[PDB]
Design a protein around this ligand. Structure first.
Ligand SMILES: C=C1[C@@]2(C)C[C@H]3[C@]4(C)CCC(=O)OC(C)(C)[C@H]4CC[C@]3(C)[C@]1(C(=O)OC)C(=O)[C@@](C)(O)C2=O
Ligand SMILES: O=C(O)CCC(=O)C(=O)O
Ligand SMILES: O=C(O)CCC(=O)C(=O)O
Ligand SMILES: [Fe+3]
Ligand SMILES: [Fe+3]
Lengths: 282, 295
């Protein structure tokens, strides 16, 4: 008795506590392409730390169909928030990444693509898209292809259906053909059943194959999010973290986090040697 | 020609003064093309000389094995060779050809360096296993010949490439087979039945090869011939390089690069359009070359 008996049931979107087993969350990730992780205070210290840089972002009102139309985005999160000390060291984050990406005896098969705070000003709904469209050939491999990208999308201010929270399409990672989602390329355009995604500090772990998009935003609510995009070791990051994150901060990171930001190798080597030698990190 | 004698596969040859369009058409037909005089004889000789000290401090590895040993590999070419960083990577024919492969309309350079590797095959080095270079990106074969290009290689003769000294063995038109598998006994049904052809080249000649082309370094059946090559490996802007050039190449040398050379090594971003635009390998909305100081 989850929907009134006889009702059409909407797409399934499982929810796990931040204390749940990694293999339990992972089976739900494979089943639907996305899961919620409730509980993934630290969220408050972070928002306050990033709030000044947020305030120095002017808003554009363009009615252009762009993703910048009344949506604020900021990436220098390691520079701006002592995040770089607590948030990225989730032993469950790595627990999941290592199940999605790593192979036995290659160590870490993953690293960071971006660390982005997204704040939808009260803004047209984002176009529906797969994240893996960032690597434009991936869709051509269809649902049999390997994962390139997963996203720990974390709520900062709460996610109402009013402030424009992300609308996810669970199960779109198993559709036979992966297309652009528009009226010309997507036969299912307009019949696509979305499910809106949430309280601060909770994260939904989404595959790069799942259709989704930010909805329309209210009068007062700036709905703020924090995206942890993590990609295959073989793919290139959107952010050049090891060129803009200062060496002072890289020295305080763990071996595994230096790898996530490319201050360390596992690809991205230095003539047969780990790049961390030449940088002075033993 | 040969005498009813079987005729081995055709590897096309062009001079470096041929138009990029004629070379590219042959590249598309066959997946590989020789560009003669890709580098001048005087440039190759100066490059060979400028890296030779580094090439002499590299110990030859000999092992008890089928593991691509007795092959020196050196990648600090920008640091060690002014002829390389000031002249070789500024080949316009190289960039002309890279655009025809990689660059989408209105998104700038679609490509950057994966590696710059001197490969010196020692006397007696065993032959390499037949392989496609895009096996580096393990999912790529699964898109088969319809797939987009992962990488191309400008593989230049620094010293002569002969059949005896281990010039690369190529399989022209293997970029067009219907199934791309690893080349082993379990997965490849033509295993042991694959016809190769060597890349016979003088110094400064190069071949240009798709990642979809099966190939392998031959066996060096000489006693005194160290067969040297310079591999300029070039990948799509969305793929990760094997060398972290922006972290080991010094900024002194970065400031003396053209903007397109800076982009090749990750000292500068390229802008991909998806509705939306995004500087790839950027800095929170801006080109990374601002924070690095390159303007
Ligand atoms: C330009 C855009 C790209 C190409 C990349 C994308 C991306 C890195 C990719 C999806 C992912 O996995 O991670 C996150 C959530 C961090 C996003 C963050 C936002 C941007 C930078 C982007 C944008 O801001 O447009 C001006 C978009 O909104 C979007 C979805 O259209 C894109 O595909
Ligand atoms: O802003 C959101 O809620 C979704 C983020 C997203 O999908 C993107 O920008 O890529
Ligand atoms: O050295 C050669 O001729 C071939 C080298 C090669 O193909 C490789 O190392 O990938
Ligand atoms: Fe998205
Ligand atoms: Fe090769």
């Amino acid at each position: 008795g989850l929907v009134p008996r006889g009702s059409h049931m909407p797409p399934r979107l499982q929810r796990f506590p931040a204390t749940a087993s990694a293999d339990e969350i992972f089976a739900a990730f494979q089943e639907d392409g996305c899961v919620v992780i409730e509980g993934f205070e630290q969220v408050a210290r972070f928002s306050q730390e990033v709030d000044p840089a947020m305030e120095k972002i002017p808003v554009e009102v363009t009615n252009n169909g762009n993703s910048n139309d009344r949506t604020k985005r900021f990436s220098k999160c390691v520079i701006a928030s002592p995040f770089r000390n607590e948030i990225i060291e989730s032993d469950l984050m790595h627990e999941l990444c290592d199940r999605v990406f790593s192979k036995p005896g290659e160590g870490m098969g993953y690293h960071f693509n971006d660390n982005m705070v997204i704040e939808v000003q009260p803004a047209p709904a984002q176009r529906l898209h797969r994240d893996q469209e960032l690597y434009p050939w991936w869709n051509s491999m269809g649902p049999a292809g390997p994962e390139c990208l997963i996203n720990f999308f974390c709520a900062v201010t709460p996610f109402t259906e009013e402030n424009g929270a992300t609308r996810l399409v669970p199960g779109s990672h198993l559709w036979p053909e992966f297309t652009q989602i528009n009226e010309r390329d997507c036969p299912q355009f307009g019949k696509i059943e979305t499910v809106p995604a949430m309280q601060p500090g909770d994260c939904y772990l989404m595959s790069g194959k799942v259709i989704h998009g930010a909805g329309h935003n209210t009068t007062t609510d700036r709905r703020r999010a924090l995206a942890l995009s993590i990609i295959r070791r073989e793919l290139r990051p959107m952010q050049a973290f090891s060129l803009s994150v200062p060496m002072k901060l890289a020295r305080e990171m763990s071996e595994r986090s230096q790898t996530m930001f490319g201050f360390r190798s596992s690809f991205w080597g230095n003539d047969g040697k780990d790049i961390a030698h030449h940088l002075g990190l033993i």
